[PDB]
Amino acid sequence: MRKFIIVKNVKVDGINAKSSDITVGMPPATTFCGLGETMSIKTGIVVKAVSYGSVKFEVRGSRFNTSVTKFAWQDRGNGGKANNNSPIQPKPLADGVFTLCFEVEWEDCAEVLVDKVTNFINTARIAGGTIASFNKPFVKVAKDAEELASVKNAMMPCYVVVDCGVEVNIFEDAVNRKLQPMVNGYKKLEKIVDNKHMRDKFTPAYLATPTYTMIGYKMVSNVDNFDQALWQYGENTKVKTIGGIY
Amino acid sequence: DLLVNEFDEDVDVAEIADMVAGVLSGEGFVTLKVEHYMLLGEGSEVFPSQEFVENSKLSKQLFDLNGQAAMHDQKIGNAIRTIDTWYEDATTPIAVEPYGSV
Amino acid sequence: GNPNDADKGNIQTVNFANLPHNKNTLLVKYNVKFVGDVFKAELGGGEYSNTLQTALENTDFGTLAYRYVYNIAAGRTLWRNRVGAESIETVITVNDQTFTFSDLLVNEFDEDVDVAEIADMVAGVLSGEGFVTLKVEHYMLLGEGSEVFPSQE
Amino acid sequence: TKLKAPAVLAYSRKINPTNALMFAVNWSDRDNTTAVMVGTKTVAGTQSVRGNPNDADKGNIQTVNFANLPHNKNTLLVKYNVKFVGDVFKAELGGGEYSNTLQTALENTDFGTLAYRYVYNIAAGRTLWRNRVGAESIETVITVNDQTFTFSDLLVNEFDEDVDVAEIADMVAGVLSGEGFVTLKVEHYMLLGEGSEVFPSQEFVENSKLSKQLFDLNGQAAMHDQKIGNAIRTIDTWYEDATTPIAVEPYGSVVRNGVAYRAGNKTDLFTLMDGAVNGKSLTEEDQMFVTANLIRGGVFGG
Amino acid sequence: VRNGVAYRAGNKTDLFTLMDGAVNGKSLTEEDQMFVTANLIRGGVFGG
Amino acid sequence: MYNTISITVVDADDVGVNFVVSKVLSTLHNKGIFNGEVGVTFPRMDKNVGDIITLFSKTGVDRKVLTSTLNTLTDFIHIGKPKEADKVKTYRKVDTKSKGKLIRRCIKRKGVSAETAESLYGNYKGEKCKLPYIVVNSKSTGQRFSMFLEECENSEKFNSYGLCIV
RNA sequence: CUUAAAGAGUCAACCCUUUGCUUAUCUUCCCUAUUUAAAUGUUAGCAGCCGCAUAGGCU
C-alpha cells in the first residue's frame, strides 16, 4: 500500500544552477532522486520514486549572462595572493519555489511521517540551497488512477517534469523540436587507482560523464499519468521513469 | 538600536546567543525568521544586491524576484560571518577568511 | 421545477400605477395621426415601389380604415385595463365633430355608421395625401381606486 | 402521447385587490374619514455590527417611518376594493391544446366553496395581517351591487357556516366560473385604541437611507395590494399535515416559516395540473387546489 | 410574440413572398392585397 | 408553591406569534392586573420564545380573569389548565442606554457651563447592545420600546414588567 | 548521503531643446416587456434619570 508525502512551496536559496557545463539552471534528476536516498540513509524511510514541479524558478543573473559570486581565497598556496579579488570559475546559482512528491511505504500512522520528514527538511540542503519557508507535509493514499487523480488536482499550480526522450542526439534535438535537455545518468570511464583522496576510503571510485535526455514542462492539471512524471533509480547508474517516455 | 561597530553586551541578545550556542556546541538545528524595519523617508532609495554580470543592456542591475527587490543570501551570510577582531592591528570587524583578506 | 428553494424569499421593488381612491374611472388620452401618401418608400424606390403602387391601386381602403378605427372604437388599445370594466366609453374628436362609442364588440367586427363615418374619411386620407389627427379619450369603470396597467419597461 | 406544458405559460390574475388605505374614524361616527399619515422620525444610536471595534459608535440619523392614529380618533379604517374577474381559465401566454384539456378536466369543479373561502377571508378580516391584533371587534362591511352586508365577529381559521357569507358566495362563484366580473368595496372598522399603533406594509430600503420605511400614497399610510391578495387566497388546508389555512401556492411555501408544504411530496401544483392535463383522475381535494392556484395566476413554465 | 407561434409564416404567406409576387406580376385577391397595404401602412424594414 | 398555568398562542404564523404575546403583555400591563402582584414566567428562553407563557398565580387562579382580559384576542389564544408544580423561575429586565442618553444624563446635572464639560464626555463610553432576548412591548409614556431580558433569581417583589430590588 | 563541499559585485550620473491637425459630412428607417409575487426578519432599548454613570431601579 503506497504512500505519498508532499513538500509544497519550499523556498530554495543558494542552489547552484550548474547541473553541467552544458545544462545550467535546474539541478538534474540525479539530485532529486538522491534526495530519496538521503532520507533513506539519514532518516531510514525507504523512498522508491520521486517527482517534482516548480512553482517559481529564477537563475541569479541577467538575460544572457548568469554568473558567479566573487570566490574566496580558501586554498593553500596563495599566501601573498590574497589582496587580489579571486580566481573566478563559473558557478551560477538560482532560487526557486518547488513542490516535491515522495513515494514511501510506512506501515504506521501518518502522524510520525510528517514530523520525520519535517526534521529532515531542516537539516538537509536542496542542492546547496537553503530552505526558507515550506508548507506542512501531508500524507496521501492512492490505490488506483482515480485516487491518483486526487494527487493530481492538489498540486495546482505547478509545472511538473516528464520524460521526453532523445531522437538521435542532444543539440540537434534541442534545435528542431525546441525542447529542454537535462542529465539523467552517468557513464563510468576510469577507476582511480588510489583511494587515499576519497571521502569514503572503502568504496571504489570511477570517473563519470553526464548522459542527457529531453524532458517536458507540463501543467499539473493536464498530465494524463503521474507515473509518467515520477522518477527513480535505473540501470546502470542512470535514472528513468515509471511511466516511460511521454 | 544597536551599535554595529562595537559589540556591546546586553541581556536581550544573550538568550538568543545561548539558544544558538546550544545547537552549535552539539547537534541539531535552529531557525530564526528575521525582519528589519527602517524609517528612511518618503520615497527614499533602497539598495538591493547587485549582480555579477557583464550585461550588455543594463550597467548596474539590482537583484530581483519577478521584479521585487531582493538581496543575496550570501550577502547576508557575509555580514553574519563578519566577526573578526582578532587579527593584528584590529580596529574594525572583517569577514572570516582563511587569509584574513577582504 | 425549482422546488429546492421554494422557501427562499424574493425581495425586489417594482413600480406600480394605481388610480387614487377619490376617483373611480380611468381616462386614457392619446392622439392618432393617420398620415397619407402611404405607398412612398422612405428608403429605396422607384422601380420596385412603383410596380407595388400600380399593383396596389385598386385596394379596399374603406374596410381597412373601418378595422383601423374600430380597434380604437372597440377599445382594444389597452389590453389589460378592460379587465373588469362596467362600460368603456370612447370618445373621438376629429376636426370638431365628437363621436362616442359606448359598447362595441372586441373580436367580431360590428357594422355601424358611427365608426364608418370616421372610416370613410380616414380611407380618403390613407388613399390620397395629407393627414388626419383624431384625439381619443377612453373612460372606463374599473372600480374605486382600482389597479391600472401601463406599459412596463 | 404524453404531451408537455409550454415553456412560456402565464395566467392573468382573477382576483384584483386594490392597495388598502388607512383612515382614522370613530365607532359612533363612521363617516368622517381622517387620513392616517406616515411620519419619518429619527432613531439614532443602534450599532454593533460585525468586526467593528471603534466604528460601532456612529449615531446614524435614520428617520424611520412610524404610523399612529391621531389621539382624537380611536378606530382604524381599512378601505379597499376586490374585483373578482370571470373567464378564469384562459391563458394569455400559451394555449391552446394544454388549457383546453384543462377545460375538459376542470369543468366539474366546486367553485362555491372556493368563493365562500375567498369572501370569508374578507369576512374574518384576514387581510389585515396585524391590525387585527389588539382589536376588541372587527366590523367588516362589504358593499356589492347595492346591497351592503356587515360582519361583527367571526372566526379567522376554522371556517364557520353562515348565510351572510354564503349569499356573497353564491353570486361570486357565478362570476368566477362564467364570465364578467364583480367589484365589492370593503371597509374594516377596528378599535385599536386612543392614538394606537397602526401597521401598514413595509418596504425595501435603499443602500443607506433609513432602516424601515413604510408604504405611502400621497403621504398617507397604506398597505400593499399583494398583501391583500395574499390573505385573499389563504385557502390551502389540503396538504397532509398542519390544518391551519395557508396561502395557495404551487409549492405551498410560506417565507415567514421557511418550509414548503407541497414541495418534494409530488403535491406541487405543476404536477397536479400536468397530470390532470394528460388524463389521470383527480379528487375534489386536489382539483380545487389547481383551480385555486389558477385563480391567482403566475408563471407556470420553464 | 406572446403565444410564440407565427400565423402567416410557415405557409409561405409571409409578407415578403406576396409583395415580391405582386411586383413580379402574379395576380392577387382582395384578402392578400389588403394584407400588403395593411402592413405597408405599419411600415418597417423590408430588405436583406 | 406556584400552581402554574400556561397560555398558548395557537396559529399565529401569519401575524407573528411573539407579536401577539407582546400585545397580550401590553393589554395586561395597562388594565387591572400587574401592579405589583405575584408574577409571570416565560419558561423557554432560548431563541425567540413564541408560544407558551406561564403565569403561576400563587394567590389562586381565576378562570374568569383569563377571559375578561383576553376577550379581545380570543382568535389566537387558548387557555391552559392549572398544574400542581413549583419549578418555574422569575426573570429581570436589564437596561442599556445609548451614548446620547448618558450625554443628556450629564447635561441634566453635575455641572456643564455651556459645552466644555459636555466635551469631556464626548468620547465614547463603551456601552453597546447585546442580544439575549429583546422583546417588544407597547408603552403609554415611551414609544413601543423593547425590554432587554435576563435570567435572575427569586426576589418576591414584582412590577408591571419585571423584578425589583429590596 | 544531492556537479556534495564554498565565496559581499560595489560605485557615479542634467536627456533636452522646438512644434498649426486641418478641411468637410443626413444614422434611418419599426417594434405588446410580461405575468405574480407577505418585505420576511422590525420580537430592534427610548422622553427619560432613581442612578459615579461602565453595577443595580421606575412610569
Automatic annotation (TrEMBL), chain A:
The organism's place on the tree of life at top rank: Viruses
Protein's name in the database: Uncharacterized protein
Organism for this UniProt entry: Vibrio phage ICP1_2004_A
TrEMBL record, chain C:
Domain of life: Viruses
Name of the protein: Uncharacterized protein
Lineage of the species this protein comes from: Viruses, Duplodnaviria, Heunggongvirae, Uroviricota, Caudoviricetes
Part of the intact protein present: 52 to 204 of 306
From TrEMBL, chain F:
Superkingdom of the source species: Viruses
Protein name: Uncharacterized protein
Source organism: Vibrio phage ICP1_2004_A
Organism taxonomic ancestry: Viruses, Duplodnaviria, Heunggongvirae, Uroviricota, Caudoviricetes
